[PDB]
Amino acid sequence: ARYGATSTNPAKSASARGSYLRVSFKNTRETAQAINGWELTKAQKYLEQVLDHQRAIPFRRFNSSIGRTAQGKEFGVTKARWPAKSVKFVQGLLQNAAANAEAKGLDATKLYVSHIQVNQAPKQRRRTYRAHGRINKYESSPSHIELVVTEKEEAVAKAAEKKVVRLTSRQRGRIAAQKRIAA
Amino acid sequence: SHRKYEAPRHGHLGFLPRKRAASIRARVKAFPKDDRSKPVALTSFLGYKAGMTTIVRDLDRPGSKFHKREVVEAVTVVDTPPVVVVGVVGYVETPRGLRSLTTVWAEHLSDEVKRRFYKNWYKSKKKAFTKYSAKYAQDGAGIERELARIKKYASVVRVLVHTQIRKTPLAQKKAHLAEIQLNGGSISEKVDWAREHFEKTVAVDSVFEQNEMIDAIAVTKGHGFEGVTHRWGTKKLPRKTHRGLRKVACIGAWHPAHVMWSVARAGQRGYHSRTSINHKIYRVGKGDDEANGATSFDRTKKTITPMGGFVHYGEIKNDFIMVKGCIPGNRKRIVTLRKSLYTNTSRKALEEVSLKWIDTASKFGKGRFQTPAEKHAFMGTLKKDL
Amino acid sequence: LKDVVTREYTINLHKRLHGVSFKKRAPRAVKEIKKFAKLHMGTDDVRLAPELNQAIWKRGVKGVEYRLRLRISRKRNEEEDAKNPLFSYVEPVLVASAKGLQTVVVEED
Amino acid sequence: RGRGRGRGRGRGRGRGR
Amino acid sequence: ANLRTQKRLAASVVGVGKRKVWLDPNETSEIAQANSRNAIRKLVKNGTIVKKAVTVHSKSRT
RNA sequence: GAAAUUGUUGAAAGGGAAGGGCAUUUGAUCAGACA
RNA sequence: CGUGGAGGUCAGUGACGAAGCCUAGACCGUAAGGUCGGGUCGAACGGCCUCUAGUGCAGAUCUUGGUGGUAGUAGCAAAUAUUCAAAUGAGAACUUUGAAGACUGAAGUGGGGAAAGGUUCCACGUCAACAGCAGUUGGACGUGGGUUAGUCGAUCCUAAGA
RNA sequence: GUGAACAGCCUCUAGUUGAUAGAAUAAUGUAGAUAAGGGAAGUCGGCAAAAUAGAUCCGUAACUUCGGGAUAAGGAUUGGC
């Protein structure tokens, strides 16, 4: 339990997570941000085309000195990549999250991903060897991945505030003057 | 301090920036000034650069050593199929410049023109200029009201022409649309000349003629990213130079603390728009006449295409213009031939050029024969034919 | 349209290995045949017979022949239903010289 | 330390007079 | 399977190097069960492992 | 289970820095007395 | 004004929640600070009158520990070179087998030893970490097996010496 | 095997095919090269590079401690049958 900041109904939702996964944190964040809010049935088809180099994952924040490509025109960006290792981990949790839906009794035609969050994990330490007999760090950046799928609903909330009226003595006598004259 | 010695500037500062052109077709920035007494005629033409060959002619230049002597000169061959007028455009005078007012198109447009307006022509429904064709379905008042506005206003009138790409050996299948200014008089007659020429073809001999000095406007052959040694022609560093020698040593002084715009730097070379002037016309050929390569001194029955055709281009089957010298741009490139903006009387022009021989040997190697019958006569018979 | 067919092609492998490094010509000729079979058959899984691999590597890395006579047969995929239902099997044709032959459709006789 | 990072002895480099 | 240890035993049993030991690829199921040198001698007898005679170095031009 | 640091969500601003002081508008929010 | 501890006092507060922490929530003081509400938390803590000190940090190329921008950037380019099919497996550019192409060219990338290492040797099982890609593989991990002398050496003799 | 040769080069026995890969072939690099006419005009300076090169035959100066200098310098020949 103890997921991120979610504003969905827990009754009509299903969750799945994965901890201490040895994948790049920067590569996983771009794939998580390129899939948030999408329908689950369209999320799984889009991720399969990334492995076939048909569509690309737009890089928005961790995108310094990335080579630009022509497949970013769909998302209005120039720099995009195909992080195949992170997609195979993200789609491995989409399959697990979708499997928990029929156990809870959720019809798969209306699931869309509403919350997905990735954050850093404790690092695995190794070392490299540099010139003049020096030793630097050589570390991985794992991540914790969690996502929640939720049923889509429409026509939620009518009946806004009542907007109580505050009138003064002179204004009540003014609005009663047009009423006795016209509509 | 002073340099050590004075040296000339490397390169020309007026040709900046050296960036890629915005289009493959070079723009016509200037047109010859209009003369009201002259009849209505075109000011430029569109063609495709085929290649180059060699001409032998007599030199008529008094006071020179090669007078009444033969010389060889390199010439360019430009394939110029007749263009088709598809519309007219009028320009009114404004304190901010020239402004387009009304564009009137023809009733029927070929698929070559419609190919220009689509990027996915194989997927489109080809609906271009379908509702505009309903303006000709009435008595004609819809087009005439837009045409009478060009006679009153729009002191500058330009015509819309397109190339017949299907008459060339190119596999590009798409016409090139351009604006050509009409140079005549009586502005009303300019739109009457354009109205009669809708869906009509004008040849190349009606615009240009023999011994005429013209200007060539085209896009330079591209070369991609280039170093500073070839882009600007700077001196190479000695062999002892560490970290490379094909560079510029000093790119600027300490003060000002910025790199100036006048220093030589690496970047894109080629694919620029250039305008070469003072090019004499040597031949105005015909596509419906055989023996284009023949001359009144050679008399042999042969056309201008070399043995095996032009390299990377093909064979000429339409009208062509032969231009002495070099033309910017490589083969298969759209070019715009334009008349001179001034009357030249330097005696390099005004001479009548009469050729003696046209070289038609193969440009795929060291050709030894001009005609296929000449190859059979010199070599006799072979094993394959007999 | 599975329509299993078997044809015999002639590939101009001299023009596909032009300006290629001498230590990569034979490896790239294997990749060019798989690209050749993908264009004419449409299948993504292309299997090359070990006898045809001996024909490319007959004269070392920089010894690829100018023309090769091949036989591409399109079959049905088995063994746990991979992504495509059809694959292409390419076999060599033992002739004196593959110089002057065109495409011939070989019937399943 | 190694053959690089030369600052001290010099033929015409720094640390002269 | 992993027939790395079977090629090492067959080289010493036959008496040649590892470059001249041939293992049947269609009969790889029963080669992996031969863990001792006594069973390796058994496969050579029935033709599962052959000798793979030497490469000819002709001296005719000499 | 704090800070540096990071993700998600929500709110706001952004023409070669950002942050601050005085004054007010706008938005959000809070209090008092109802004797 | 604030901190650690000490004497006295408020027959002070507290598992019906003490201390700590969080809080563009509130109040008091010119300020150092103090108080309250809410969230979290789980066992001790405070007001005042006095005593006492290892008693207040933004710096010292401070110490120790942790984390950033740079940045998914520099880079993973010597030693001529790999390719096809099958098998195994959740998964194969890298494992195994077959076939092909190559190299070390016998002052070798061959077969043995000395110094040194100490179980790396062999078998089976395993893939979290390690093998700066990968891995079903490994000098890795886990469990076991293995070194047989009257003739080979030490042991004996003496050299420079001790 | 070639050759004077334990040189270089190719092969047999034996042993490896292990050094992160894939796709393209911009600039600038590292390594290897070729250049018309001139031939050190370059540069502190022939730096770097180029030329010469094995064998057989001919020929070989000044000087000298009479031993050398000397492969002096300078020329010709080289396959196959």
Swiss-Prot record, chain A:
Xref: CDD domains: Ribosomal_L22 (cd00336)
CC terms in the record's Gene Ontology section: cytoplasm; cytosol; cytosolic large ribosomal subunit; preribosome, large subunit precursor
GO biological process per UniProt: cleavage in ITS2 between 5.8S rRNA and LSU-rRNA of tricistronic rRNA transcript (SSU-rRNA, 5.8S rRNA, LSU-rRNA); cytoplasmic translation
Top-rank lineage group of the source organism: Eukaryota
Single GO molecular function: structural constituent of ribosome
Keyword Nuclease: no
UniProt cross-link Glycyl lysine isopeptide (Lys-Gly) (interchain with G-Cter in ubiquitin), position: 45
Residue(s) carrying Phosphothreonine: 69
Matching Pfam families: Ribosomal_L22
Stored InterPro entries: Ribosomal_uL22, Ribosomal_uL22_CS, Ribosomal_uL22_euk/arc, Ribosomal_uL22_sf
Cell compartments where the protein resides: Cytoplasm
Other facts noted in the record for this chain: There are 2 genes for uL22 in yeast.
Function recorded in the entry: Component of the ribosome, a large ribonucleoprotein complex responsible for the synthesis of proteins in the cell. The small ribosomal subunit (SSU) binds messenger RNAs (mRNAs) and translates the encoded message by selecting cognate aminoacyl-transfer RNA (tRNA) molecules. The large subunit (LSU) contains the ribosomal catalytic site termed the peptidyl transferase center (PTC), which catalyzes the formation of peptide bonds, thereby polymerizing the amino acids delivered by tRNAs into a polypeptide chain.
Oligomer status and interactors: Component of the large ribosomal subunit (LSU). Mature yeast ribosomes consist of a small (40S) and a large (60S) subunit. The 40S small subunit contains 1 molecule of ribosomal RNA (18S rRNA) and 33 different proteins (encoded by 57 genes). The large 60S subunit contains 3 rRNA molecules (25S, 5.8S and 5S rRNA) and 46 different proteins (encoded by 81 genes). uL22 is associated with the polypeptide exit tunnel.
UniProt similarity note: Belongs to the universal ribosomal protein uL22 family.
Record-given protein name: Large ribosomal subunit protein uL22A
Curated annotation (Swiss-Prot), chain C:
Main location: cytoplasm
Domain of life: Eukaryota
Compartments it resides in: Cytoplasm
InterPro entries with a match to the protein in the record: Ribosomal_eL31, Ribosomal_eL31_CS, Ribosomal_eL31_dom_sf
GO molecular function: structural constituent of ribosome
Transmembrane stretches, start-end: none
Record GO cellular component, one term: cytosol
Alphabetized SUPFAM superfamilies for the sequence: Ribosomal protein L31e (SSF54575)
Keyword vocabulary terms for this entry: Cytoplasm, Ribonucleoprotein, Ribosomal protein
GO biological process: cytoplasmic translation; regulation of translational fidelity
PROSITE patterns: RIBOSOMAL_L31E (PS01144)
Further facts: There are 2 genes for eL31 in yeast.
Summary of subunit composition and partner proteins: Component of the large ribosomal subunit (LSU). Mature yeast ribosomes consist of a small (40S) and a large (60S) subunit. The 40S small subunit contains 1 molecule of ribosomal RNA (18S rRNA) and 33 different proteins (encoded by 57 genes). The large 60S subunit contains 3 rRNA molecules (25S, 5.8S and 5S rRNA) and 46 different proteins (encoded by 81 genes).
Family, as annotated: Belongs to the eukaryotic ribosomal protein eL31 family.
Role according to the record: Component of the ribosome, a large ribonucleoprotein complex responsible for the synthesis of proteins in the cell. The small ribosomal subunit (SSU) binds messenger RNAs (mRNAs) and translates the encoded message by selecting cognate aminoacyl-transfer RNA (tRNA) molecules. The large subunit (LSU) contains the ribosomal catalytic site termed the peptidyl transferase center (PTC), which catalyzes the formation of peptide bonds, thereby polymerizing the amino acids delivered by tRNAs into a polypeptide chain.
Protein name in the entry: Large ribosomal subunit protein eL31A
Source organism: Saccharomyces cerevisiae (strain ATCC 204508 / S288c) (Baker's yeast)
Gene: RPL31A
UniProtKB/Swiss-Prot annotation, chain E:
Positions where Phosphoserine occurs in the chain: 29, 36
Localization (cell): Cytoplasm
Residues in cross-link Glycyl lysine isopeptide (Lys-Gly) (interchain with G-Cter in ubiquitin): 20, 52, 59
Sequence similarity: Belongs to the eukaryotic ribosomal protein eL19 family.
Subunit structure: Component of the large ribosomal subunit (LSU). Mature yeast ribosomes consist of a small (40S) and a large (60S) subunit. The 40S small subunit contains 1 molecule of ribosomal RNA (18S rRNA) and 33 different proteins (encoded by 57 genes). The large 60S subunit contains 3 rRNA molecules (25S, 5.8S and 5S rRNA) and 46 different proteins (encoded by 81 genes). eL19 lies in close proximity to the binding site for eukaryotic initiation factor eIF4G.
Comment field (misc): Present with 97700 molecules/cell in log phase SD medium.
Function according to Swiss-Prot or TrEMBL: Component of the ribosome, a large ribonucleoprotein complex responsible for the synthesis of proteins in the cell. The small ribosomal subunit (SSU) binds messenger RNAs (mRNAs) and translates the encoded message by selecting cognate aminoacyl-transfer RNA (tRNA) molecules. The large subunit (LSU) contains the ribosomal catalytic site termed the peptidyl transferase center (PTC), which catalyzes the formation of peptide bonds, thereby polymerizing the amino acids delivered by tRNAs into a polypeptide chain.
Protein name from the UniProt record: Large ribosomal subunit protein eL19A
Source organism of this protein record: Saccharomyces cerevisiae (strain ATCC 204508 / S288c) (Baker's yeast)
Gene: RPL19A
